[PDB]
Amino acid sequence: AEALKCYQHGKVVTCHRDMKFCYHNTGMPFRNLKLILQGCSSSCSETENNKCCSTDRCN
């Protein structure tokens, strides 16, 4: 099996062979601070900030 590939802040990363998901999480911890997490993960749950997917470079 090929291993999932995900977008990660402009780069393309090859996920650990165990990963099921590419994710994209954006948050505003403070009115002036935006946080953006992005990459591969074993688990993923759709929320208003965490976007999940399971195909290649799908972010």
Q: Domain residues of the chain, as ranges?
A: 1-59
User: 21-30 and 33-41: which strand pairing?
Assistant: antiparallel
3-class SS of residue 57: coil
What amino acid is encoded at 14 in this protein? T
Closest CA to 40 of 2, 4, 1: 4
What amino acid is encoded at 52 in this protein? C
Burial class (CB in 10 A: 0-12, 13-18, 19+), 23: buried
Model resolution, angstroms: 2.5
Count other Cβ atoms within 10 Å, centred on residue 51. Answer: 17
Task: Yes or no: say if 13 and 45 are a contact pair by the CB < 8 Å rule.
Answer: no
In order of 3, 14, 15, 29, 43, the CA distances from 18 in angstroms are: 8, 11, 8, 30, 10
Can you give the length of the chain in residues?
59
Q: Which one-letter DSSP state was computed for residue 10?
A: T
